[PDB]
Each structure stands twice: as C-alpha cells, then as structure tokens.
Design a protein around this ligand. Structure first.
Ligand SMILES: CCCCCCCC/C=C\CCCCCCCC(=O)O[C@H](COC(=O)CCCCCCCCCCCCCCC)COP(=O)([O-])OCC[N+](C)(C)C
Ligand SMILES: CCCCCCCC/C=C\CCCCCCCC(=O)O[C@H](COC(=O)CCCCCCCCCCCCCCC)COP(=O)([O-])OCC[N+](C)(C)C
Ligand SMILES: CCCCCCCC/C=C\CCCCCCCC(=O)O[C@H](COC(=O)CCCCCCCCCCCCCCC)COP(=O)([O-])OCC[N+](C)(C)C
Ligand SMILES: CC(C)C(=O)OC[C@H]1O[C@@H](n2ccc(NO)nc2=O)[C@H](O)[C@@H]1O
Ligand SMILES: CC(C)C(=O)OC[C@H]1O[C@@H](n2ccc(NO)nc2=O)[C@H](O)[C@@H]1O
Ligand SMILES: CC(C)C(=O)OC[C@H]1O[C@@H](n2ccc(NO)nc2=O)[C@H](O)[C@@H]1O
Lengths: 533, 533, 533
C-alpha cells in the first residue's frame, strides 16, 4: 500500500511535466520518421515533407497570434485612427475607383469574350435588384455585406477559373475526396455482399453518407473541422461585416450538411435572432455536403466547378440573406461564444465514430422513402399529363415539357444561350421539385453524349449541349434547396431548439428562395468568367 | 417606400375580391379546356366531360343544402310529426310487412337456388344469436343498429352482385386502383435498381404502402377523403342510429388503414366512451386498406368481391360492435365536432407528401420483422408436429391438418359445401394466426389451379375448389384481424390517447373476435346471394 | 338474464377448482400420449420419455424444496454451528490441503503434457496478479470470490474437456441450437426472396437475431429463462459469495445478449451500487449471446469449445470484476427481489413474440451501420499505412502487421506456441477494434486451411496453425468486448436507468478491460487442460 501511495504521489507531482514530456517524445519520433524518409529518397517523401512543413507553419502562426495579439493590435491602432480621420473624404474616392475598375474590366474582358458572357452580368444585376424589391424590410438594409459578398465571390472565381495553378488544385482535392469516399464503397461489400452493386443507390450510394458522418464526427472530436470553420468565418467577419454565429454556420456548410451544420452552434440556437436563423437556413439550402461530392464527380461532373461552387455559395448565401431579410434587432451572441464549438462528448475516438454512425440511420431511411414516393408521383404526373394532352392531339405533354418553358427565363439570364436554356431549365425543374441527385444524373448523361460525339440533333430534338452551359448548370444546381427537403430542415431545427419552433416555420419558405437565388448568382459569375468554347 | 405602401394598401383593399377573381379565372380556364376537348372529339373527351358534370352537380348540391337547410327542415317537419302521431299502431304494421317480405324472398330465391344458399342464411342467424348470447351487457341492447346494419349489407350486396351495371363499376374501380398503385412499383425501381423484382415483397410490395400513405396524406390536405367520409357517415347515422364519432371512423376505414384511421378523430379520443372505442377497434379489425387492394387483385382475387366486402364490412362492424358491447353511458362528443376533421398542418402539398411518406417508415419495418418471426415460428411448429406425429405413425401432421378440422364448422355455416369447407378452414387459420396476405396467396394458388384445369383430385387429395367457395373465402378473409396485429393497434391507440391506455387494453381482445364475426356475416350474405355454379 | 346470472354464480364458485381440473386433464392427456408412444415403439419414443422424466423430477424437486424448506434448514443448522466452532483451526488445514492438491495435479498432469501447457497456468497467475496491481481499491479486496471463480472454471472445464460423456453433450446442444436458428434462415426467404443468399449478412445473418429475440421474449413470458437463471445464480451465490443482482445478471448472460440482459433486473437498476453496475457491464462484455452461436458453429468453430467458453466466462467475469473494482458500500437489494423477474406484460404469447420482434429493429440497423463505417475505416487505414511504408521501402505495412507484434505477448502468456502467437494476435486485434464476427471468420478460414491440408508454409509465410492454438483462440475471442460496442452498452443502460447516467459512463471503460481479461483467463485454463496434438 505504501509503495502504491508513493507512486501516486510521484504521478501527481509530474502530471503536467509528464504529459508535456510524452507529447514531445511523440512529436520528436514523428520528425525522426520524416527525416529518415527524406534522407532515403526525397522525391517519394515529398508529400510527407510538405504536410509537415505546412502544419509547423500553421502551429507557429497560431501560437504567435495568441501570445502577441496585444502587440499586433497596438501596432494596428494608429492606422485605424488615421483612416477614420480621413474617411469622410476618402470614401467617395474609394467608391469611384472601384466603380471605374468594374467598368474597365467588364468592357475589355467580357466585350471581347462575347454577348453571352455579358448577359450573365446583366442577370447578376437583375437578381440582386429583384431581391431588393421583394425584401422583408426594404427600407432598412446594410449594403456592405451584399457588395463584399459579390466581390469575394468574384475574386475566388477569378483565381480558381482564370489561373492554371488555381484550377489544378481543386481538381486534385476532388480526386482525393473521391478516393477517400470510395474507401466506403469497398467497406460496404461485407454487409451487403459482393452483389451489392446490383442495387446501386441502396447499397453503394447511401453507405457513403454513413462513412462521411462517421469521419466528420471523428474530426469534430479531434478538433480540425472547427479550426477551418474559424479561419473562414474570421475572413468573412473581417470583410463582410456579418454577425459571428451566421458566419460560423456559413463557413461550416462548405463541407457539412444542412441537417448537421446547426449542431455547431446548437447551444445558442434558442437565443438567435430571426435574421440569423434565416441566414442559417439559407446557408443550409445553398450548399451541398462533402458526401455527395464524390458521387457527383463520379457521374462526370467536374471536380473544380463543384468545389468552386460550394466555396462561392456561402458568401452568396449570406449576402442574399441580408438583402432578403435584413436584421432589425441587436445580436446577443458574442464572437468568443460562437467561435468556440464544444467537442464531442464521446470519451474516445471510437465512441465518436460509433455515435456519428448511429445518427445516420434516420437520414438514409428518410432519403430513401422520400425518393420512392416522389419518383412514383413523377410517374403518375407524366402519365396523367400525357392522358390530358392526347385529348388535344399532343400526347407528348409531360413534366419536362412544361418545366422547359417555365424555367427558361432564369436560364437565359444566367448567360446560357437561347437553344440550351430549355435544356438547362429541365434540370432546374428536376432540382427544385425533386432533389439535385436526379438533376446531376441527367446532366451527366448530357455530358457523356457530348463526349461520345455524334449528331447534335438526331431530329428536331437537341441531344447534347455546349461545355459552358454545362459549367453554368454545375454552378446553378449545386444546392440542397428542394421542396421535399423543406420538411427535414424544419424538423431538425425544431428538435434542436424547441422554443423557436414558430420562427423556424415562419421564415422557412423564404430561405429556399434565397438559396436558389444564391446558386443563380454563383452561376452568373461563372458565366461571366468562363469563355465561349 | 411610398409606392410599396400604396401597393400594400391596394392589396389589402381587394383581398377577398382578388382571391375570388383569380379562382374564377382558373375555373373558367378549366371549363374552356373541357369545351375545346369536347368540340374537337367528344368521344375521347367523354371521361373529362363526365367528371366535370358530376363535380358541378355535387358542388351545386352542397351549396344548396348549406344555404337552404332551414327551409328543407321546415318542409320536412310536418311529416315527422304526422309519423310520430301514428307511429304507435304503424310500427307493428311495418315490422310485419318486413318479416313477410323476408320470408317470401328467402323462400322463392334461395329455395330455387339450392340448399347451400340457405345454410348461409342459417349461419347469419346463428352468428347473430351467438353474439347476443355472449354480449358484455346482454340485458341492455339496441336492436335498431343491428337490424339496419344487416339490411344495408343485404341491399348493397344485392345491387352489386345481382345487377350487371352494379357489377361492372366495381371491377372498373379495382382496375383503376391497381393501375394507380402500380405507378408506385415503377417509381421504386430507381432506389432498389431494375433488379428490385429479385426481392419481391421487400422491394415491390412494401413500397406500395409508402406511396399509398403519401397519396392519402395529400388528399387529406386537399380535403376530399373528408368529404366522402362525411357522406357515408351521414348515411349510416340517418339509418343505423349510431353515434357520430364511431360512424365517422367506420366510413373512413373503407379505404384507410387501422393504424391511421383513428387520426381522423384523434382530438376527441381522450373523451370517447368505452363502447365507441370498442367500435373503433372493431371497425379497424374488420376492414382492409386500399394499399393491399391492388396486390390482392393482382394475385387473382376478384376486384368486385374485394371492394364489395370492404364496403359491406363497416356496417357489419358497427352492428356487431353494438351487439357485442352495447353502450351504457351518454356520448359527450357532438356531430359537428366529429364530422369536422382538421386538415394537415403542412403548409404546402409537398410538405404533406413528405410527412405522409416519413410516417410509413415505422409501419414497413414492423410488418417485415413480424412476418420474419411468425413465418419462422410456423416452420418450427410444422417440424415439431411432424416429429410428434411420427411417434404415432402419422408423419403428415401439421398446422394445416389441425386447422382444417378446427375451423371447419365456421366454413360450413357460411354456406361452403362440405368438401370445400376444410380447404376454406385452412385459409381461415392462416388469416387468424398469420396475416391475410399469406391466406390470399394460398387462395390465389387455388384459383389458378382451378383456371388451368386438370384433375380435381390428383389422388385422395383435392386440388382446387369451386368458384362460389372462392367468393365466400374472399369475403371471409377480407380483414386486418390477426393476433400478431393486436399489439400494433394497442400501441398506436395508446400513443394517440395516453390517458385511455387501460380502456384500450381491456377491450382489445373482444374487438378482434367482433371483427372476425363481421367478416363471417359479410361472407354469409355473399353465400346467400351467389348462385351455385 | 336469470340463467346467465346462475351460470356466472356457478363459474364464480368453481374458479380455482375448475382451473385445477382443466390443467390436470391436460397433463393427463399429455401423459397418455407419452405412454401410447412408448407402448408402440419405445426406441423412437425415447427422447419424449426422457424429457417427461426430467421435467417430472424437476417439478417434484421444486415442490419439495418449497414446502419442506424449514425442515431442511433445521436439519442443516447443527452442522453449520459445528463447522463454525472448529473453523478457526480447520481453515488452515483446508487451505493447505487445497494448495497441496493444486501442486500435485499441476506437476503430474501438466509436466507430462509439456511446457506450453504450463505457460498457460503461468499466464493465469500473471493476469490475476496484474489485475490485483491496478485495482480501483487495492487495499480492500475479498479473495473468496476470486478463488471460487477460478475453481469453478477449472472444474467445469475439466468435466467438459477431459470426460468423453461431458464432451459429447455440448456438441449435441450446439447442433440443436444450430438447427433451431436455421429454422430462421428458411423463414426469411419469404420476405427477401429465394435470392436472399445473394446478400448473406444482410438477409441471412441479421434475421437470426430477430428470430432469437422473438423466441427469448416468448420464453421470458412463459417463465423458463428465469428458472435456469435462478438455478445458476443460486449456485454462484452459495459458492462465490457475490451479491444477488450481479449473480442473476451473470447467469443470464450465458444465453442473453448484453443489450437485453440488464432488463432482467431493470426495476432495481436505479438503486444498484457502483460495484454491481461494473459487474453487470463486465458480464455483458465477457459473454456472447445465443444468436451468434449457430453462425459461429456454422463457420467451423467447435460447438463444445464455444459453449464451454460461454459457460466458463460468467464466473470469470464476476471474479475479475471483484478483483478490478471491489465493493466498498452496502448492497441494498435483497435476494428475493433480485431473483424474482417480472414476466412480460404482453397479454398472450403472440403479443410477446410481436413485442420481442419489434425491439430488434434498432439493433440490426445499428449493427449494420457500425460494420459499414468501421470496415471502411479499416480499408482507409490499410491504404494509408501502405503509403507511409512505401517511403521506407516496406509497402507491406498494414493493420495486421502492427497488431501481430503488439498483441503477441498476450497470446504467448495464454499458452500458444511462439510461431502461432502472432497469428492469434492478429485475431485478437480484429476482435478488439472490430467485432468478433470478423475474427471468427478469419479463424474459420485458418481452420479450413488446416483441414484441407497442404504446405504449412507456402513461403516464409505460415498458412495454418495447430489445433490447440485454435481452441485457445476460440476461448479467447468469445466475447462482446469491442470498442465500437462501448457506445451501445452505455446508451442502453442510460435508457433503462437515466438517473445513473454518470456512474455508467465513469466505469464503462474499465469494464471492457475486465471482460477481455476474463476471456483470457478462460483461454488460459483451456490451454492448461488441452493436450498438445
Ligand atoms: C480587375 C477586376 C475588376 C474590379 C472588380 C472588383 C474586385 C474587388 C472585390 C471586392 C471589394 C468589394 C468592396 C465593397 C465595398 C463596400 C463599401 C461599404 O459600404 O463598406 C465600406 C468598406 O470600406 C471600403 O470601401 C473598403 C474597400 C476595399 C476594396 C478592396 C478591393 C465601409 O464599411 P462601414 O464603415 O462599416 O460601412
Ligand atoms: C325483396 C328482399 C326481401 C326484403 C329484405 C329486407 C330489405 C330491407 C333493408 C333494410 C331495412 C331494415 C329495417 C330495420 C328496421 C328496424 C326497426 C327499429 O327498431 O327501428 C325503427 C326504424 O323504423 C322503421 O321501422 C323504418 C323501416 C323502413 C324500412 C325500409 C326498407 C324505429 O326506430 P326508433 O324509434 O329509433 O327505435
Ligand atoms: C485434482 C485437481 C487439483 C485441485 C484443484 C482445486 C479444485 C477445487 C475447486 C474449487 C474450490 C475452491 C475453494 C476456494 C476457497 C476460498 C477460501 C476462502 O477464503 O473462503 C472460505 C471458503 O471456505 C472454504 O475453504 C471451503 C473450501 C471447499 C473446497 C471444495 C473443493 C471461507 O469463506 P468466508 O468465511 O466467507 O470468508
Ligand atoms: C444519398 C444522397 C447522394 C442523396 O440522394 O441526397 C438526396 C437528398 O438528401 C438530403 N441530404 C443528403 C445528405 C446530407 N448529409 O450528408 N444532408 C441532407 O439533407 C438532401 O436534401 C439531398 O437533396
Ligand atoms: C405489405 C402488406 C400488403 C402486408 O403484408 O400487410 C400485413 C399486415 O400489415 C398490417 N397493416 C398493413 C397496411 C396498413 N396500412 O396501409 N395498416 C396495417 O395495419 C396489417 O395488420 C396486415 O395484416
Ligand atoms: C449479427 C451478429 C452475428 C453480429 O455481427 O454481431 C456484431 C456485434 O453486434 C453486438 N451484438 C450482437 C447481438 C446481440 N444480441 O443478440 N447484442 C449485441 O450487442 C455485439 O457487440 C457484436 O459484436
């Protein structure tokens, strides 16, 4: 007993020192492994070396910003005062310079590119103007978020699309995500057998959502997801001027789904304002999750365009939300509380994986059931429309024919040419009424037909559409905003915050419209920047 | 801002006028479409014209009954007083005339038809007498519901079975339902692949319940289901004399399942009397849903007989419930409250479809699991009975052999001939212990063997049975009254009304017996009316 | 009415007499059937005769112990006092005799058997010593439970393994269980079609858990499971000295799963001590359910070893729990309350079957989802470890290679030879991180390779391992203690007893370690007793 007591006292004495010592030993071992790999053959060890270097750089940066925050603020203070003193006369100068730059760039670039590239800018203007017209509180609007959101979208798109180094990186990332989620498909062979490919959607696609949920929960436990969310949220906060909680939600939605994204700020959902809840729902509707990215890239959809659309949507979502539901009340929640995200309560990583996996049981079931019902309804609708049309000697009437004409103006304003606007409109209808998975499937079919080659028109029916129309379609359809999905968002948000049940329902419908408009804005910028093939 | 205010004021001024104007414009457009279709080719446009005419007639009738209700009641009042004044002497005359008519019809018709047609009437009498013997409160019974229920059953059966125009309509309706639910099977190919037919029950049959639930929820939101329920309930109320809530539940169960039917009067379930709750459960047990109708017609079961059985069961259910659990306490719930059914809280049709689809997730899982367990138990029972029989040199002993002898008297009383009574008894055993899906499958096999032709007896075993026995079996087995299903009804009703948890359990067992007896009564009437082939 | 009243009075008079009369008539009929079967052909009727004789013997024994309990206690009292008076000097004599017997048996038997048979005893000592070292309260420990647990394990193993009559019985029981659960596989063909074998795990294996749950619920309703649990618990109680509730839980876990076993003492879970809750969790982790037994026997795993391991684990679980978390507080719960187990609330057997079947819906879904996620994670881990290894010119690095070296000492201490210890270590790693189903699959592959014959080493890789190593592996891996499974146990126990939510989490981790150590102890005894092939 005495020896055990002495050992316990020794352990108590060295607790912090011992933990630091063991962590340092582990880090030194990792560095030794890296250096050995570099010694033997640097070329093979290049990825590991790059990862280590970037990790060290980020850790050093974080530590310095933490410790030296006061000194940096002291250095920055005089410039802020000098700017404030001269801001009155300088604001007009800055605004004029920005307008002149916009005019010069638009004229030269787009005028040389063609007419269709300019109709996209016209559509950008039209969408923003219409959203201003039908705003909930038109009189009280803050324009800084809107302008900064559009500007950030333009800059990100310009870098990624007009620079070869920028274009290559997102392709690489898309391939990595595809492989990582393809690890899931192999793992699901065990449960459903090697004949799981017989039932593709049930036994191949849905298990990818289970694997993605597990991985996301593990990363949440470790504390990485939070880091990236904080960085992007700080960028948006320091430029757009939005509130903290909505920024954190928006940055998270780049990779997290709509159902799970509010869990980041769950503890403060009871106290959020109506505008912030509308922003949350709009961000949820305007962006897709990482799980679907691999499947959509597999269909044939471009990795670069999908990732760029997902990144660009969140600033667009916040801007459109502010222009479609401006805030009229003070925000209670603080920056420190919002940025802080409680880690998973699971004791160990494997418990976090188990809990993340179990949660996915509801989602997959709901998805499968909704798909069954809605596709059966589509079949009934087509048969009845054909029956009605036969009376008027037009047996070809269908959902697609109606939706081609109904949604054509939106496609034309986005910069799609007149002939292909109808084809894009059919896909938009599929995305709105049914989910975007079906729409991406149809788009993949059209892309494959273009790649195979052959007659553009077999008969007076067009078979495939141009590449730029496909890019604009990729941007436009990159969302979770479908009417069938309105119920699940409401139910989840009500579950997380029962007190706010009424506010969630009141603003739910406007959020879907805002998300669609945000996707359209991303598409318009893409059309402005992509050249005519 | 001023222009927006002026527009808002103008919108406020014209609200009702504007809504009426737009609705009128839409109706005028529909009428123009109909008239154009009739102009071009009337023969093709015949269905649309008929639908429009009947809809207009019903709307006019409803409006007139609403506005002119007081005048019609004033016109009707004197006749009621005149009847009441002379009722004392006239009641004996009416009863004697009815008895004489019954005697004359029975003698002529059934005596010419044969002995078996008359044993069915004998069985009708026997079942009613036995239910009177073992009633919960034999002394206090109201005979008007029982007599009116039997009479309405007889009239509906006579019209549908003995009139060619009546017979054709239900066949048409069954075909329509089959097609509408076959739209579901096509829609479920997407989720489970084109190889979904490999697993028929899991991937073909169960999805039909999901599609049916979605459609029923949408129609509930629109307000049609309620209209039909109200009409049939009013008929039963004005003739049988039952209470409002039980009548509404009974009329709804013609097409709605047992689990979902109480949701029509959910708000008042806490306050219903014990007799009314017994009536609710009995109606649930004695009738089948619309989802199963398409499958059962597909197996080979007659559409006309299935629909006629479903329609006839509800009056039989109410009559048998009143004779098996007569009411001893005053009914609190009013006619207006009961007839009124709250529409779905879903904001839009698509939300209603989503909510209806999500609810079906539990039901399909419970059904599949119960089927697995109970069929495995049947396999074990057969193997052990064969093992026991081998000791006594009878290795053929099985569940079917025991159930053929046990249930034979019920089949004989229903009017089935002696030879086929055992075959019907096997099916009744399958229906009672396991669900009626298996029983309908066996019945379909026997029907197919009859249709193919061949030896009636391959050896001293009969292979197929006569057509009339099949009709009586179709009527007898048309129910959801199985012992495995007792749990789900109790759980659902307890969920809807937690306060009444004890009353639900106390009367649950008697309800199953009452439902079986009601199915037997429908079968007896069918046997009385169907001629010997 | 008067006749009904007279009949009711007559029924009231004879209630108990009538029930006894009918039960006696049924029993007499059963005896008549048995005697007829014996008359015709005794040899065929032998199983029925044996079952009847044993049932009669047990009923007579139970009745006599009930009625004559006081007389038996009176007879036993003097001997207890005489033993207590002389216990002071006799305890040393008894302990010395036991030690001398242990020494003599160990020397003769194991020394003749070989070195490996003795390293197993050494490992037994090592595991017990280590558990004593790292105990929660090392100072306060009761050694009687530990010593009695080890002794009972040794006696059961000796009987079952070293006696031919003992060995044959468990093989017979395993075959019976396999057949009874194979009844399930046939019954599940209906729901998933005859092509259900295409997806083996989803459509063949998981349905066996549904059938097992249904059967267990029915037996719980009837009152058999409880009888066996009480008998085994009384044995453990009268020898080990443990508390009642933990003994009841431990005896139940021989055949009941971890998720469902606490339901036996659910009503008193709010009041159990921390030590008893740790014992419950340890018993849950150290034993497998009956559902998996048929599958594992089908793979090729020996029936006798599996059943012996399951039986031996529970005393080991209790002993290791007492040595790893000794009790420091008084136990409130009484023997009578704990032994009594409330029967199912279901009114009839079929309701119990339905309720048992419905409960399984959650378990199968959780199992399937966890398997998908964890196997996908294994695939990712292997690919990344291979990628890292390629840098150091060792592309074969994998999870298996690391786990072979990490877990080798445990396998060596269990008595496995040096060459096969690595192969066993791989299986132990599979069991710990992933569930034991995968590990048993790999073990079945190795057994099949041994049985086919061929090169022991195709190259410098060993292909199959010796029979004794397979037996030790069968004992070692016979558990539900996997890290993925930690979450489900916590969630279920928290659901049953919400008040104790914190105590459940605090002691959850130690329980898994204790369960693994208990499995290792069973393996060590098996290695000590099994001879070298
Ligand atoms: C070649 C391509 C063509 C050019 C495309 C343009 C690309 C530029 C992309 C993005 C820049 C978008 C700037 C939007 C300015 C919003 C003005 C506003 O009301 O808030 C003001 C922001 O204060 C500023 O004005 C700062 C502006 C810095 C500009 C950086 C570039 C003051 O904020 P407040 O006091 O809180 O009110
Ligand atoms: C050719 C086929 C053979 C004939 C088959 C018969 C087919 C007839 C089918 C259905 C008619 C069934 C009539 C049942 C009468 C129940 C008597 C009763 O107690 O309540 C009475 C109903 O008052 C009546 O008696 C009205 C009867 C109208 C009969 C319409 C036909 C008085 O009600 P109460 O004052 O509230 O008490
Ligand atoms: C041939 C094979 C080789 C031999 C292997 C051995 C196989 C023997 C297997 C099992 C016997 C294990 C006996 C363990 C004794 C524990 C001692 C203890 O502290 O509690 C004591 C138990 O009192 C006893 O000592 C009773 C012992 C009876 C022995 C039956 C055999 C007193 O209890 P307490 O007063 O409550 O304190
Ligand atoms: C299986 C996938 C590819 C699919 O078919 O998606 C259809 C609908 O499922 C919703 N969804 C999906 C994933 C998610 N997190 O991973 N959250 C969601 O809400 C979302 O509305 C979408 O449209
Ligand atoms: C899939 C269908 C054809 C089936 O196999 O039915 C078996 C059992 O499922 C119950 N059931 C079914 C549908 C329903 N609403 O659509 N409510 C119910 O309660 C009912 O007891 C029946 O016997
Ligand atoms: C389908 C079976 C063979 C399987 O693959 O099992 C994997 C994991 O499922 C857990 N499990 C299983 C059954 C049960 N009662 O029958 N209770 C449980 O907890 C347990 O942890 C095991 O490791």
């Amino acid at each position: 007993e005495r020896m055990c007591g002495r050992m316990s006292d020794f352990c108590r004495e060295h607790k912090t020192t011992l933990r630091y010592i063991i962590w340092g030993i582990l880090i030194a071992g990792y560095l030794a492994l890296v250096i050995a790999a570099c010694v033997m053959n640097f070329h093979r060890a290049l990825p590991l070396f790059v990862i280590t270097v970037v990790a060290i750089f980020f850790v050093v940066w974080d530590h310095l910003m933490a410790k030296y925050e006061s000194q940096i603020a002291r250095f920055l203070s005089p410039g802020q005062r000098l700017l404030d003193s001269h801001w009155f006369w300088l604001k007009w100068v800055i605004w004029g310079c920005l307008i002149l730059g916009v005019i010069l760039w638009l004229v030269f670039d787009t005028a040389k590119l063609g007419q269709q590239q300019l109709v996209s800018f016209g559509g950008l203007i039209i969408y923003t103007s219409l959203t201003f017209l039908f705003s909930k509180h038109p009189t009280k609007v803050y324009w800084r978020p809107v302008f900064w959101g559009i500007g950030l979208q333009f800059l990100l798109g310009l870098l990624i699309l007009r620079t070869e180094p920028g274009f290559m990186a997102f392709d690489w990332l898309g391939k990595q995500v595809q492989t990582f989620l393809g690890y899931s498909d192999a793992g699901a062979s065990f449960v459903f057998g090697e004949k799981y490919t017989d039932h593709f959607f049930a036994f191949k696609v849905l298990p990818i959502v289970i694997f993605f949920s597990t991985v996301m929960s593990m990363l949440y436990y470790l504390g990485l997801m939070q880091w990236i969310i904080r960085k992007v949220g700080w960028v948006m906060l320091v430029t757009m001027g939005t509130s903290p909680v909505e920024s954190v939600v928006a940055s998270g939605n780049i990779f997290i789904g709509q159902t799970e994204s509010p869990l980041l700020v769950r503890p403060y959902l009871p106290y959020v304002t109506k505008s912030e809840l509308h922003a949350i729902m709009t961000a949820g509707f305007s962006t897709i999750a990482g799980s679907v990215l691999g499947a959509y890239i597999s269909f044939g959809v471009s990795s670069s365009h999908l990732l760029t659309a997902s990144v660009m949507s969140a600033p667009a979502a916040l801007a459109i939300s502010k222009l479609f539901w401006p805030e009229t009340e003070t925000p209670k929640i603080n920056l420190k509380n919002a940025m802080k995200m409680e880690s998973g309560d699971s004791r160990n990583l494997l418990e976090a994986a188990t809990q993340g996996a179990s949660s996915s049981i509801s989602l997959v079931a709901n998805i499968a059931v909704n798909l069954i019902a809605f596709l059966a309804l589509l079949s009934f609708m087509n048969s009845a429309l054909s029956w009605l049309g036969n009376m008027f000697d037009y047996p070809q009437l269908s959902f697609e024919v109606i939706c081609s004409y109904v949604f054509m103006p939106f496609a034309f304003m986005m910069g799609v040419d007149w002939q292909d606007s109808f084809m894009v409109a059919k896909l938009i209808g599929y995305k709105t009424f049914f989910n975007e998975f079906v729409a991406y499937q149809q788009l993949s079919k059209l892309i494959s037909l273009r790649q195979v080659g052959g007659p553009k028109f077999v008969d007076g029916v067009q078979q495939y559409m141009s590449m730029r129309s496909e890019a604009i379609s990729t941007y436009a359809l990159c969302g979770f905003a479908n009417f069938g999905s309105l119920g699940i968002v409401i139910g989840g948000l009500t579950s997380m915050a029962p007190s706010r049940k009424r506010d969630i329902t009141a603003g739910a419908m406007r959020a879907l419209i805002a998300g669609t408009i945000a996707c359209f804005l991303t598409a318009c910028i893409a059309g402005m920047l992509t050249n005519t093939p």
